[PDB]
Design a protein around this ligand. Sequence first.
Ligand SMILES: NCCCCNCCCNC(=O)CNC(=O)[C@H](CS)NC(=O)CC[C@H](N)C(=O)O
Ligand SMILES: Nc1ncnc2c1ncn2[C@@H]1O[C@H](COP(=O)(O)OP(=O)(O)O)[C@@H](O)[C@H]1O
Ligand SMILES: Nc1ncnc2c1ncn2[C@@H]1O[C@H](COP(=O)(O)OP(=O)(O)O)[C@@H](O)[C@H]1O
Ligand SMILES: [Mg+2]
Ligand SMILES: [Mg+2]
Ligand SMILES: [Mg+2]
Ligand SMILES: [Mg+2]
Lengths: 603, 599
Amino acid sequence: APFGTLLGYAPGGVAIYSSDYSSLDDAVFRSYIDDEYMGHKWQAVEFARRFLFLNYGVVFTDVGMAWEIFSLRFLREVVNDNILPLQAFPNGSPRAPVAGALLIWDKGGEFKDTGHVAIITQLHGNKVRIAEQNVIHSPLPQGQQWTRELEMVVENGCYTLKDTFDDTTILGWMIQTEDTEYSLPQPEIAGELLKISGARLENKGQFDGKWLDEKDPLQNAYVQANGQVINQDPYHYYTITESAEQELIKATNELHLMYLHATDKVLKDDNLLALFDIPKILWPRLRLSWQRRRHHMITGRMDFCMDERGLKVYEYNADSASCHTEAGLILERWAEQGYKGNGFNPAEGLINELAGAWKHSRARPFVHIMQDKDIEENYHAQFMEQALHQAGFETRILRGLDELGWDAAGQLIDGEGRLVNCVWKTWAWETAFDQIREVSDREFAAVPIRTGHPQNEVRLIDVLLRPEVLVFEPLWTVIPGNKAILPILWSLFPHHRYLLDTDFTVNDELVKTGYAVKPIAGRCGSNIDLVSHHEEVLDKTSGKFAEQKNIYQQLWCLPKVDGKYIQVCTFTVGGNYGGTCLRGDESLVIKKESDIEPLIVVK
Amino acid sequence: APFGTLLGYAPGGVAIYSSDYSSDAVFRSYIDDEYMGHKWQAVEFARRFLFLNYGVVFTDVGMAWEIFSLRFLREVVNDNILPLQAFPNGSPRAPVAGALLIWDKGGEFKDTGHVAIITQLHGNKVRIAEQNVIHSPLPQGQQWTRELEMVVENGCYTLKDTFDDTTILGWMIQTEDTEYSLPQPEIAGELLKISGARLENKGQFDGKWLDEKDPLQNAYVQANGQVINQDPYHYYTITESAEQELIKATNELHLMYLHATDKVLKDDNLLALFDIPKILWPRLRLSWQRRRHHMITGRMDFCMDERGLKVYEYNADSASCHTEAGLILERWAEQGYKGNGFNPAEGLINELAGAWKHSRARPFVHIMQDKDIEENYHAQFMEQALHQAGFETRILRGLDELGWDAAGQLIDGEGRLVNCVWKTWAWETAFDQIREVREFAAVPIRTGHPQNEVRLIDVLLRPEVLVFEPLWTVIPGNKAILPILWSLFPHHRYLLDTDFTVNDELVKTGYAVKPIAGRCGSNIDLVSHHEEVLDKTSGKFAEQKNIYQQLWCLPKVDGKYIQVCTFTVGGNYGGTCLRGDESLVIKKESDIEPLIVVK
Ligand SMILES: NCCCCNCCCNC(=O)CNC(=O)[C@H](CS)NC(=O)CC[C@H](N)C(=O)O
Ligand SMILES: Nc1ncnc2c1ncn2[C@@H]1O[C@H](COP(=O)(O)OP(=O)(O)O)[C@@H](O)[C@H]1O
Ligand SMILES: Nc1ncnc2c1ncn2[C@@H]1O[C@H](COP(=O)(O)OP(=O)(O)O)[C@@H](O)[C@H]1O
Ligand SMILES: [Mg+2]
Ligand SMILES: [Mg+2]
Ligand SMILES: [Mg+2]
Ligand SMILES: [Mg+2]
């Protein structure tokens, strides 16, 4: 049957289409049910997820290949962002494969690389019936709600299934419950596959002069701020196994959910929100932003620590994040100029990933881009405008605020006399939050913004907080961006493998392990204080946030490879993994002036 | 400045438009799916300000002065209810900024009254931001319309308006602090009495007073001939005071009811009390979330009299008697009424059309009714509203005309895909078809069948089909919610103590036993405080769970027991009607009584 042909339904009346493409017949491939993404039309995963959502209102995180599903340990309940537990069971197990359970196949034979995922509709005395997409492309029998039957075998309490193929491996089934009995543990990876490795290029004088094309305005923009220099030794680059990246993608999609699951919890209790030191006048605004703009986050960066010790996360820059051009364009150019290998730059598709985000965002036709007057932010801004243009939107880059002004009534318009109602800022939300605390001793009934002024002096706050102006990133991003959320994440996912015990007061265990003091609203590594268990200040950086609240996070020093400390950074575009990049530095603390270290994933 | 001209903004960037009409749906002001008011009255700005700045809103009200009588506020993002206090102009409680300032109708603010927002409080005056008082631009960047003179004498704060014939009721603050505040006003039971009357038997109803060549009117006749009740020359009346009361009571209980629904769907232990097949629960939740604002109409059962105003149930699901108060009674009054009074359910047809316009319903709506000449006009009365709303309709009587195609897609007796459906059928009926059956992995509906034999669930629970009323409505329409409303709003003036067991209290006051998912007064058991069964009705729900509601027998005016019913159209009062009965139990076979409101 043709691609998209309704072949029939599964229990509850869930459609099953023919995913049969054909070299004889890009965003339209996204399957959505309202604002919730189901998958890719019409893979096995898309159906599996849509089945669970339409029938149980739950969904499993984003996954590259279907076989990967078997490694997940939880599902998300949509209507409340609540996380439920998911258990795994091997083929041939005491825990019986009940109807509604997930059945996963491992890449192999009939499912060479992708693997497979299906749903069990009904169990029997010696056979189970299942529903699945992308494996059968012919219209099912009228009324039959299952695509294939599988010979089950019950022996002394052990349920085993035999597929209808002779070259496929049925991993097992998955059930949503707290009863861990008979289940398999959460797969931890071999630390050795997580270590960072350094390497060098054959110095054929590849980066001796103008290797960065200055014809390209974007690259020339980069130079204007950094010249023809990415990092000290441009002939040296690090690498990570494909196994390691997979891990990163995994830990990125998972921590994203966790972060939102906690963001949603904080906005549901004034006792927690009260900890982020955010102007009480904005609380209602935060909650509204969280509710109506739940899926509007464009991108964010996650700081990690990776090596033999395992993978841990330092912070999640969900509000403002740079380094997009670096791992995005410069490195591509770097590789294109000097890397003659088989590896690949993990951020070689960030621009495209962004355009996709913007297309599916509800941003308006014309988007004013707000940046500071730092020539250092010119390329970051132009890098995004490019993505925006690729998405089709129209833009105009605003440098500073001198161009803004109000009409007679009080409407926010730009220099050319146009109305500003949708902006993408490079400005941190915290900066706007400060223009509020300046006049904190006044009793204002609402956020103190100007809708008019003699000198026509517009302020950052007089824009981002102007009700009818749509902003990216959404206001709620400030919550998962504030480090005050770490203690809560630990409180919610205690002892999680990617987490570090964090608290507002140097508790007891932090003491015996050492810890890092970090301002909740900081960044660029400012005012960071590392204290080991021997109560010795391993390092201390200055900064302006020296007067904010702090949080204490169990120490977990960055690894040192080839004379530098290497931190790993993954990107999140629209909630899913978007790429990776390294940030090396002489000190344990990555600061603003750290360098970008070329990275190549090898197989 | 002409209509809808931006004059300026209030603190927080809340626009203020010129509501100069001198220069029909287009007038509704929204912010997303949430209603803000009528463009561009005072109430509109006041509400939009509270929603934009604090994420809260206040219930629908006829006039602005009516705000002062409210005692709650709804926080959108969580459908949670917040307490609101009212203070008189001259109260020790200073009028802080962000508070509502209500003007009682009078002088400059004749019949409407008025409401504004206190932006900044000084020491000798205050500044406010209103909307329907001016109509000219505001000074460049001025975030306030007027400054009012505040006088402070011995702990008390007073305010003088700029007009000499206006009356300032006071301000309102959302606080738990109840000091200095005004207790919620109550109405003298004497105005709540239901009076009886009679028309001049000039012989106006002795023959064919029903047009009959009006598909609707005729439809009605095919089921009941030319009769509405026993004596067409007798009617009842209620004061405008009582109607406004009935309206206030409706709007409030509606919110109260959804607050309980939102709660029920957030706690498994609670939802478990309704006996709704677990398999559906996820659907229920999903429905509440996505269909929150898609309810079209519901009906409330009230006991009104000197004693006060109590509500028995809220038929949020399968309504009824719409045509009655809606049309027939209009043909009644038109035909035989002379007085100045009016029918409280006249513009019901328009209220529904309005609700339908703003519903997200698909373009072609299939109307599903059972095969009873009785439900015909109810279905055809609704169809007319849809048509006035611009939607296309096709009435399906029974499930025979339906069928599937090769793939398994639902279609009507003309091969058209059925995707939008307004049902008269009760959701509980569908639920039963699920109880009839295996450890099914989902709602057991059919997508194919040898005889092409479709069932009710095979339609209502089919994903791509958009049903009205949405699934979540079965919660507020299930009597199990009563015990919860009591737990949430203890001794609320409109609620009656209800429990799933005859607690001590009920025993002393007497009670009514009623099946949680029943209707039409089926299996109703009324026991007195003497412990004597006052009345009993048999029924088809005898076996399901019950709840006990403290007895509170309907009044008896002119030989019959009069019960009052209010309609809800889009979560707001849509009209009123009566239902008399020889007995204390209103049933499916009870008559409708012409109701007239007089001032
Ligand atoms: N001849 C022109 C006279 C113009 C008088 N303008 C005085 C304005 C005064 N204060 C107001 O307009 C507020 N008016 C109101 O109270 C009115 C009545 S339709 N009600 C509505 O806005 C309905 C709101 C709606 N019921 C809701 O619930 O939000
Ligand atoms: N718990 C920790 N253990 C060891 N080093 C840490 C820890 N937390 C932070 N650091 C170091 O400090 C730097 C700054 O902390 P980070 O969490 O990224 O905040 P930001 O960059 O926003 O200031 C990191 O890049 C890392 O090198
Ligand atoms: N607490 C009560 N005290 C006295 N009569 C009651 C009480 N509750 C219900 N009734 C009577 O029983 C009838 C049926 O109850 P109701 O709550 O409307 O359920 P339904 O009409 O759906 O069966 C009402 O119309 C009313 O006359
Ligand atoms: Mg960092
Ligand atoms: Mg940071
Ligand atoms: Mg009822
Ligand atoms: Mg009733």
